[PDB]
Amino acid sequence: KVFGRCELAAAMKRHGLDNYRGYSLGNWVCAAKFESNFNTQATNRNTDGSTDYGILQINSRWWCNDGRTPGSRNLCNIPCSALLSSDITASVNCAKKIVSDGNGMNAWVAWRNRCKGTDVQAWIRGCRL
Ligand SMILES: [Cl-]
């Protein structure tokens, strides 16, 4: 599924991401835009044999099991295939674990480089929440 901006904002708000662990909703929408272009089926392979899955590009070395990543820890206790659903619940529930692990939203490279330090509230402007 490819979400619209406000559609994704509303879905993320319903699943409890607004202000979760200190991160306002616009952070999460900005991260999804630059990680996956709002596409629930995005995947990207990495040089360590891991793959990033879904709308928030969750990595198979640490967080989900894809059966093909050496050294996997599966800390979200979910198959990576669940993260390619058009329903974002499993991705959001795993993202909540990732942001609580330690280093906040710094797990998302595109957030760190392209969202942090900007006015991220602009990402939810004009949306009916
Ligand atoms: Cl899988």
CA–CA gap between residue 29 and residue 119 (Å, rounded): 12
Provide the edge-to-edge strand list for the sheet that holds 58-59: 43-45, 51-53, 58-59
CA–CA gap between residue 96 and residue 56 (Å, rounded): 11
Ramachandran assignment for 59, one of left (phi > 0), alpha (psi -120 to 50 degrees), beta (any other): beta
C-alpha 45 chain-centroid distance: 16
* Catalytic residue status for 87: no
Q: Which two tokens stand for residue 89?
A: 């619940």
**1-129 to CATH, choices 3.40.50.10610, 1.10.530.10, 3.40.50.300, 3.10.310.30:** 1.10.530.10
Q: Which of 18, 52, 87, 119 is catalytic?
A: 52
Residue written as token pair 């490819």: 2
- Sign, CA torsion 122/100/11/3: positive
101 is in an annotated binding site: yes
Residue written as token pair 């509230």: 121
* Catalytic residue status for 35: yes
- In angstroms, what is the span from residue 129 Cα to ligand 1's centroid? 33
| Experimental determination approach used | X-ray
Instruction: Give resolution in angstroms.
Output: 1.3
Q: Which two tokens stand for residue 33?
A: 């835009």
Ramachandran assignment for 10, one of left (phi > 0), alpha (psi -120 to 50 degrees), beta (any other): alpha
CA–CA gap between residue 49 and residue 51 (Å, rounded): 7
